[PDB]
Structures are given as structure tokens and as C-alpha cells.
Amino acid sequence: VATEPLTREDLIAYLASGCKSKEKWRIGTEHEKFGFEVNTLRPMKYDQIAELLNSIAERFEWEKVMEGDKIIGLKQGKQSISLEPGGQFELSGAPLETLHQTCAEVNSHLYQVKAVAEEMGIGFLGMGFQPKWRREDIPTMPKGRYDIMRNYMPKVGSLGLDMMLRTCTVQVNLDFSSEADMIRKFRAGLALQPIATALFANSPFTEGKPNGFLSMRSHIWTDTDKDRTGMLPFVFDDSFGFEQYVDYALDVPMYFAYRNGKYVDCTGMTFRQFLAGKLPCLPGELPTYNDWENHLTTIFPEVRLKRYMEMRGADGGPWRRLCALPAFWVGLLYDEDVLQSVLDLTADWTPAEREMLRNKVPVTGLKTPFRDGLLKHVAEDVLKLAKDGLERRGYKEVGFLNAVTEVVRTGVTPAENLLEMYNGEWGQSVDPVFQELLY
Ligand SMILES: CSC[C@H](NC(=O)CC[C@H](N)C(=O)O)C(=O)NCC(=O)O
Numbered sequence: 001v002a003t004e005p006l007t008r009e010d011l012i013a014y015l016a017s018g019c020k021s022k023e024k025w026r027i028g029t030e031h032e033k034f035g036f037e038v039n040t041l042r043p044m045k046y047d048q049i050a051e052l053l054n055s056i057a058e059r060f061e062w063e064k065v066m067e068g069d070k071i072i073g074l075k076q077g078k079q080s081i082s083l084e085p086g087g088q089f090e091l092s093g094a095p096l097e098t099l100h101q102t103c104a105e106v107n108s109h110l111y112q113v114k115a116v117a118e119e120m121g122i123g124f125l126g127m128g129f130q131p132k133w134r135r136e137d138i139p140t141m142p143k144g145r146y147d148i149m150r151n152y153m154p155k156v157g158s159l160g161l162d163m164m165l166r167t168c169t170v171q172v173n174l175d176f177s178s179e180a181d182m183i184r185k186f187r188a189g190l191a192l193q194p195i196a197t198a199l200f201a202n203s204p205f206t207e208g209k210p211n212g213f214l215s216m217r218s219h220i221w222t223d224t225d226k227d228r229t230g231m232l233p234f235v236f237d238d239s240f241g242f243e244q245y246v247d248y249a250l251d252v253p254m255y256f257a258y259r260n261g262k263y264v265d266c267t268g269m270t271f272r273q274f275l276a277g278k279l280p281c282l283p284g285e286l287p288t289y290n291d292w293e294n295h296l297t298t299i300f301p302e303v304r305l306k307r308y309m310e311m312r313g314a315d316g317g318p319w320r321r322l323c324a325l326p327a328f329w330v331g332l333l334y335d336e337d338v339l340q341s342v343l344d345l346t347a348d349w350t351p352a353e354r355e356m357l358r359n360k361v362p363v364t365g366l367k368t369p370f371r372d373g374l375l376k377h378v379a380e381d382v383l384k385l386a387k388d389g390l391e392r393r394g395y396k397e398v399g400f401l402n403a404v405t406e407v408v409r410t411g412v413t414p415a416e417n418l419l420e421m422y423n424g425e426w427g428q429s430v431d432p433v434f435q436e437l438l439y
Pocket residue numbers: 032082083084085128146149163164167168169217297298300
């Protein structure tokens with residue numbers, strides 16, 4: 001037939017077409033930052049964001065990305081700059097071969113943003129959660145997709161709006177060579193994600209006060225939406241492969257369908273309905289590969305699968321940690337012997353232990369009790385493995401883990417260091433964090 005409808009098998013093959021041989025594996029890094037007025041500390045408004053984007057475009061030669069008449073982002077080659085719902089200012093970097101390239105790319109972006117921003121009296125703050133302002137104090141960006149989500153979140157949880165408006169992450173995107181490799185990396189990534197959340201925890205403050213968490217950001221992801229989040233225990237079932245992930249994603253409710261430049265609100269409906277040409281928001285229409293990619297991009301587990309794999313557990317932070325986050329995971333997953341060692345180390349962790357670590361780390365970090373010891377002790381062994389993996393790559397990248405070495409040695413998170421400052425020299429104001437963590 002001329003156009004045969006997509007089938008479940010085609011949606012599987014879409015994911016599987018991401019398989020790449022080892023020499024073709026790359027490292028993408030994305031991170032988000034809070035913009036603020038240096039004088040008032042107020043969150044950067046859309047009109048200021050548009051001036052910033054336009055100036056970066058003209059000065060540094062980026063193409064402008066528009067939604068309607070509003071500039072929402074920039075693109076240059078395989079890099080893009082985008083906005084999250086609360087104005088968080090994101091770089092999605094290019095797929096790169098080495099972590100030296102990764103960190104140079106972070107530096108270049110930070111240099112460009114500051115070159116324009118400092119003339120506007122704008123700074124940027126790396127942290128997992130906006131430390132000072134209320135939910136209602138955050139500007140909302142003119143993006144239709146976000147309008148749909150903001151209206152939906154209250155239906156599925158009490159914290160989803162804070163995820164949208166108030167959080168920043170640093171994430172790494174990594175490749176697999178086959179289904180067997182994807183399964184092994186997914187299981188290593190999920191089991192260890194709470195260790196990464198702990199190493200990177202930086203979000204102790206809400207509305208100018210300590211909030212009772214080390215990573216409030218991570219806690220927010222447990223009250224956002226139960227259908228699309230979490231530790232995905234089924235990944236550890238013998239049955240798991242591309243097919244099972246596809247069935248999972250098919251049954252996650254949709255947000256939207258993009259049709260002729262516009263976002264159609266599809267909430268309350270599933271992609272499985274769409275596949276059958278039964279989707280009420282688009283009666284009788286059938287999905288395309290773009291629709292599938294768009295839907296995959298609305299699922300938010302601690303590790304996400306698309307044509308590549310995404311490690312989602314880490315809080316946004318200062319530049320040395322932006323470069324450390326991708327290095328941590330490359331060290332663990334990109335060496336076959338280290339990957340095996342990670343699977344061995346975690347082989348006997350139960351579903352209940354993995355879930356407990358995920359839920360406790362946001363409060364207690366590396367001081368979270370685990371078995372005979374503290375998570376700190378698992379992290380010692382994990383950090384050693386990560387460093388081994390980088391040594392074995394032979395690119396001399398191991399130094400990028402210096403930034404987490406003292407965290408692991410002392411069992412003290414970045415968030416705990418900020419709390420000591422807050423109760424210390426800062427005189428119990430969060431205001432100085434806009435200096436300490438200024439990019
Ligand atoms: C609109 S909110 C959901 C999701 N955003 C994130 O996953 C952001 C991560 C969050 N800031 C965090 O700190 O974990 C998203 O779709 N971002 C816009 C995009 O497609 O680039």
C-alpha cells in the first residue's frame with residue numbers, strides 16, 4: 001500500500017534505528033540555568049530573554065527560532081539554545097567525541113551568554129531549584145506546548161508546575177550499539193541514578209529558606225506525574241527490550257499533537273488510541289514518526305529511552321559540575337568492562353531498594369543509609385569505576401571527575417555545603433547564593 005499505517009513494529013524499529021557501533025558513540029550534554037537581574041535578583045522576564053537571544057544571534061551568528069512572532073530559541077549547527085516554561089535558559093550541545101570537547105562547548109556558551117547579559121545587568125545561577133522566588137513570581141514563556149502542560153499538571157500532581165517553572169538539570173545523552181547493549185545501559189543507569197542525584201544535589205532552598213531537602217528538584221519529580229516518571233522497575237524484568245518500552249510509552253497519556261504549526265491538546269488520550277486512528281483530539285487521523293518522537297519526548301523517567309539514552313537525575317550546577325556530569329556517565333557506561341562491573345555491583349539490589357534510594361537521596365544524599373553502610377560507600381566504589389572507565393578511554397579525561405571527588409570522599413553534597421554557608425557567613429540569607437553560584 002502507498003501509505004500503510006505505522007504499526008507497533010515500526011515504532012520499535014524507530015527506537016532500534018538509534019543503534020550505532022562503538023566508534024560512532026557520542027556524548028550530548030544539555031543544561032539549564034536561571035537568569036536574574038543582578039540588582040534585584042528578580043527572575044529574568046520574557047522581554048529581557050528576547051533581547052538576550054536576539055543579541056546572541058546577531059553577535060555570535062546563531063539562527064533565530066520563532067514560535068509565532070516571538071523569538072523562543074537559537075540554533076547553530078547541532079547546538080541549540082531553548083527556554084523552559086519558567087524562562088530557564090538551556091543549551092543542548094552537539095554530539096561530541098570527547099569530554100574535552102564537551103567542556104569547551106560549555107565554556108563557549110557561558111562566555112557568549114555572559115558577554116551579552118552583563119551589559120543588560122543580567123546574571124545566571126546554576127542550581128537545581130530556584131532558591132528565592134515563589135511559583136507565582138516566575139515569568140511564563142509564550143510557548144503553546146507549555147500552556148497545555150501547565151493546565152494539565154494540577155490534574156496529575158501538586159509539584160509538576162514547580163518542575164516546569166522552578167527546576168534546572170544537567171543531563172547527558174549517550175548511545176547504544178544493540179538491544180542487548182541498550183538493556184544493560186538502561187539497568188546500569190537506573191540503578192545508579194540515585195547516586196548521581198546525590199553527588200549533584202544542589203537545591204536546599206525554597207523561597208529564601210532551607211526546605212528540608214538536599215535536592216528539592218529530585219523530590220519534585222516524585223509528585224509531578226505518576227504515569228510518566230520514576231525508576232521503571234519493569235526495565236529489570238527478563239522480558240525487557242525495545243518492545244516492552246514501546247508498550248510502556250504507548251500507554252503513557254499524550255500531551256499534544258503538532259499539526260500545521262499548532263499544538264493540539266491531546267491530554268486524557270493515549271498514543272495507543274492514536275495508533276488505531278481512534279484519537280479524539282484528531283478524529284480519524286493516524287500518527288507519523290514525528291508524532292511518535294514528540295510523544296517519547298513527553299515521558300520523564302529517571303532514565304529516558306529514545307533513539308539514544310538520557311540520564312535525567314542531576315541538579316543544575318556550576319560549570320565544573322556541568323563538565324563532570326557527562327564524564328561520570330561516560331566513565332561508567334562507555335567501557336564494556338566497567339559497565340559489567342556496575343551491573344555486578346548492583347545485581348542484587350531489589351526493586352524496593354532501588355525505589356528507596358530514589359526516594360531517600362533527595363533528603364539525605366550520600367548520608368542515606370544503605371544495607372551495612374551509607375550510600376557514600378557505594379559511591380566510593382562507583383566513582384572508582386567511573387575513573388577507571390575514563391582512564392581506559394585514553395583521552396586523558398579523568399580530571400573531569402575532580403569536581404565530585406571531594407563530595408564522595410567526605411560524603412558531603414554540594415547542597416550541604418550551601419547550607420553551611422547559609423548558616424555561616426551568609427547570615428541566613430539566600431541572597432549571597434546569587435554570587436556564589438553565579439556563572
Ligand atoms: C516543559 S517541562 C518538561 C520537559 N522539561 C524537562 O524535562 C526539564 C527538566 C527540569 N528542568 C529538571 O530540572 O529536571 C520539557 O519538555 N522541556 C522542553 C523541551 O522539549 O526542550
